[PDB]
């Protein structure tokens, strides 16, 4: 299971000081609890909160205060609340520095599928907006069921949208339609990735 522990640790590193970050439901939300003291930042919940904080003390949860995953949560200092249209203005308009999401697949050109399986249909939620408006797209996802595809099979969340993908195994980067591997043993990845890739 430590696989995912390697995955979140590494995900903390994409997030610089001063950023406004959106953590997708599931795996990426775990990152929240690894932000070091040094790093001052605001976490955006697409349901209308800028300033997501840790989980509340028993007996102090509040029904009116939740994350996009429906979990009871906490606001930070100088947080703000706004409505859904506003929230997606922030997102669609490119104000969100970085979005982290999970995925069921990533293609070689960095297409992402993370919303549906023909015949399980949770739905896209904010993912599609995120993937097209965040300036920085980072996927953390388990590497195999393989999930690192040459071409996606599941319906696309986004097409050519991810800049960096991290897994239990390794780290991948995309520039203008093609894939490399910035981080790691080595020999296993050709074997493991259904996608095609380069490195220097």
């Amino acid at each position: 299971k430590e696989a995912r522990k390697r995955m979140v640790k590494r995900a903390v590193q994409e997030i610089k000081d001063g950023m406004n970050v959106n953590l997708g439901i599931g795996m990426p939300t775990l990152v929240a609890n690894e932000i070091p003291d040094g790093v001052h930042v605001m976490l955006q919940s697409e349901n209308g909160l800028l300033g997501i904080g840790p989980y509340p003390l028993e007996g102090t949860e509040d029904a009116d205060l939740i994350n996009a995953g429906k979990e009871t949560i906490t606001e930070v200092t100088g947080a703000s609340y706004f409505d859904s249209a506003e929230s997606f203005a922030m997102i669609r308009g490119g104000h969100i520095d970085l979005a982290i999401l999970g995925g069921m697949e990533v293609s070689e050109q960095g297409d992402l599928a993370n919303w549906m399986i023909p015949g399980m249909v949770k739905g896209m939620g904010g993912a599609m907006d995120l993937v097209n408006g965040a300036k920085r797209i980072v996927v953390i996802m388990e590497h195999v069921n393989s999930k690192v595809k040459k071409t996606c099979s599941l319906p696309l969340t986004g097409q050519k949208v991810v800049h960096r993908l991290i897994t239990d195994l390794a780290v991948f980067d995309f520039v203008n339609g093609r894939m490399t591997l910035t981080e790691l043993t080595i020999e296993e990845v050709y074997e493991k990735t259904e996608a095609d890739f380069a490195v220097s």
Partner: protein, 229 residues
């Protein structure tokens, strides 16, 4: 006392077979629970409901689905609703799945008189199939259309006799915008105050968008995940 109605029941009488209904709330947060209860109890049918989600199978809009009152659902997330999910898969319930950003903005456009507006959300995906495509600055956008309902059913923290609304925390979400899009708008409020009691610079949705105000419970607010440190 002006726009204020006696009961949830009295208010439901204003919703008719085959209407489009627009509903505030995100998951179980800021939903007009009572309003929904009494619509379930009125049994009105063939509804087109638009709301981010469909509650849970046990609560919120999912209560209408279970009672077979929804002809078509426009939303962005199924999530932890197994009745929605399965009826979706089945084709039993006609569903238009809309990205959340686009959904919010479509509803806002209905209320703001925008019949159509362009966005990048969902290009290159199955969501954009069948819609006008237009390039601006070299990049491709999809035309999305303004949404309008016969009735809007929203949930607030405080309302005044005149329909002015304040929301609390994350309980706001779709509520301000859903208020604009409904021809008849009914607001469900934990607290009712007389007009003049709410600070004009604190008001989130002006009374202009609200036609009726009803009192809601504030302890029947429900929590899907009780995640505590």
């Amino acid at each position: 006392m002006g726009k204020v109605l006696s009961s949830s029941k009295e208010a439901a009488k204003l919703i008719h077979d085959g209407d489009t209904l627009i509903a505030g709330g995100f998951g179980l947060c800021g939903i007009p629970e009572q309003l929904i209860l009494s619509i379930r109890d009125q049994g009105v049918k063939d509804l087109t409901v638009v709301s981010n989600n469909c509650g849970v199978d046990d609560w919120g809009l999912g209560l209408l689905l279970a009672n077979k009152q929804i002809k078509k659902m426009i939303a962005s997330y199924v999530g932890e609703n197994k009745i929605f999910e399965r009826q979706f898969l089945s084709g039993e319930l006609e569903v238009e799945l809309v990205p959340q950003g686009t959904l919010a903005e479509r509803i806002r456009a209905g209320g703001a008189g925008i019949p159509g507006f362009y966005t990048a959300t969902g290009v290159g995906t199955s969501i954009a199939e069948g819609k006008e495509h237009k390039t601006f600055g070299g990049r491709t956008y999809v035309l999305e259309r303004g949404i309008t309902g016969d009735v809007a059913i929203v949930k607030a923290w405080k309302a005044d006799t005149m329909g002015n609304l304040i929301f609390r925390k994350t309980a706001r979400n779709f509520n301000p915008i859903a208020a604009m899009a409904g021809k008849i708008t009914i607001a469900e409020a934990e607290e009712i105050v007389e007009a003049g009691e709410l600070d004009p610079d604190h008001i989130h949705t002006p009374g202009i968008y609200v036609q009726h105000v009803v009192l809601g419970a504030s302890q029947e607010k429900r929590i899907e995940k009780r995640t505590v440190q």
